[PDB]
Amino acid sequence: RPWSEFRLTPAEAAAAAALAARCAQRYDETDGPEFLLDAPVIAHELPRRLRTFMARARLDAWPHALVVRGNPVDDAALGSTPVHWRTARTPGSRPLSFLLMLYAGLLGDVFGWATQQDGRVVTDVLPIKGGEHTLVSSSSRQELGWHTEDAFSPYRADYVGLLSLRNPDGVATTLAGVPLDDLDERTLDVLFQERFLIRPDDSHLQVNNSTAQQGRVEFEGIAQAADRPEPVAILTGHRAAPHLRVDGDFSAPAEGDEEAAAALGTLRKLIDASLYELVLDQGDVAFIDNRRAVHGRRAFQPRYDGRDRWLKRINITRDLHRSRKAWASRVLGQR
Template sequence: MTSCDLSAQDVPPGSADLRAKCPPRYTLTRDEARQVDILARKAAADYPSADDPRFLADVGLIAHDLPAGLRQSVNRARLDEGTHVILIRGNPVDDAALGGTPRHWQEATGEEGRVAGMLLMIEAALLGDAIGWTTQQEGRLVTDVLPVTGMENSLVSSSSHKELTWHTEDAFSPYRADYVGLFCLRSLYHTPTTVSYADLSALPEDVVRVLMEPRFLFTPDDSHKMPDGTPDGSLVRAAVLDGPIDAPVLRIDRDFTRVMPGDDAAARALAHAVAHLDGNLYDVALATGDVAFIDNRNVVHGRRPFTPRYDGRDRWLKRVNVAVDLRRTRPGRLSADVRAIG
């Protein structure tokens, strides 16, 4: 047993370093993987898509049929307020049936990819309800993370040559997800996802105090296609740290967080936070069959650079945003039935 084969309950509370080295993980047995596969395929047969309102109404119940060991492990990690990432290994992936990695997320329309999306939605339902963004990948709930020609050096997840710098997912929005779920379908060279966390005991007290004040400006990242003529309408002023000092919620995007002109104390605090998060950054290399739920309140995440080949074998993840309390996101949605924010 390596030091990382710990179950969630074995991780001592408060040990951010150990959490980084040993994320709570659950490895499905072959029988359990078969059980998960059957559930996902049945859902794909019973419902037309992951966005179907009937599926969204039922998926929480479908998740009751996931293996008991998995449900117990995810539940413990959910209740641990310091969790960085929940890893579920050994999920079924039929590489041949998937076909080639699509050249663009708009082309990710294959049936086997849809089954994978259903699987991710079912496991995500152990944590909450899926939300989407009208401004992102046409408002889909299950989105695709894959390298796209021409985007190699961009600041979005379809980049490759350029490191995807760490960020709170959708930091600009009060309706952002509590978890970001990633299902790795393919990653030949194990390109790592990156994760970092704030250890407040290692930051000067005055810096922490400033980070807790609403002195920071957040703009939507480039993955959100905002309507023309909305330059500053989308600017949000908020704190980087929120909540109790022993269980802070982190909100920061290395590329899209600024301070008001002339606010030197906020600029200094932001620089401290950036250097601190840079220093705590560690790798989580997802392999085929891994599902990772990143706690978007406790950690920031990104991705190391890689060289895409555009040969149909490139890295490919399915992604979902999960809200623990769907009602919290309601002001951002048109109606109870609409899951896309915006």
């Protein structure tokens, strides 16, 4: 498989769950300053075989994601799937939010965005009625097209963490790496040049945040990136193992640059044809390598009956200080 996989034993999974439940008893909130600081050290108490997997697999050269299977979830304890992210911090989902945060702390520094879901660090992926055909993660009937998370931003996550609270119909997450087996050298050369434009996705729009949040100055920086994007490369790093920065629904060539456009159009077709599926069943956790892979989610028919697919999500950076200019409480944004 193109990702690295780990399966908890039932005893390991129970121990991790018990640690998260203890955290939920001892801290008021996952995003509070106290748990943000303490979670990386508390995670040292997770099952050792899991800590070994996370410490080693992050350093491997090849995986598109790190996948951990087998966390127990009881639908009766979890409760119904919220109708909106605003009300999605339910008591039934609270221990599992702490659990995701603990796993994330083994990989890096967690953070959020002032412009996304009210600046929350642990965010929610669930279908919002009336928002089926949008470009944000609360879509359903329209596929979420492949993209680098927050491609517009130099401060985008290194890893995107996902914990599947429920997914009864097995809706697939989509992934693709760099199609290096099919990129000719000239096309590769062009993709490494600063000849492309990449704008903020719709999740950072004020209409996708609560009222009283539309006044955050960080939305100004989002407007600047959408109205005046600066040219950037799509590929960076080692030509034999490039890092990837692209959004299928927001990337464009520089104005009038037809050679850049040809390279991007070629890349689109290669990624479309190599896109593959990862199904996060209930209790599965994935950390997607946001430099090696683009990701999306298949179209699906929402239920709106209380048992819709529901993920918790978290952004992770290897170095919080890389985003110093955007520090707005572990919440990023710029004027």
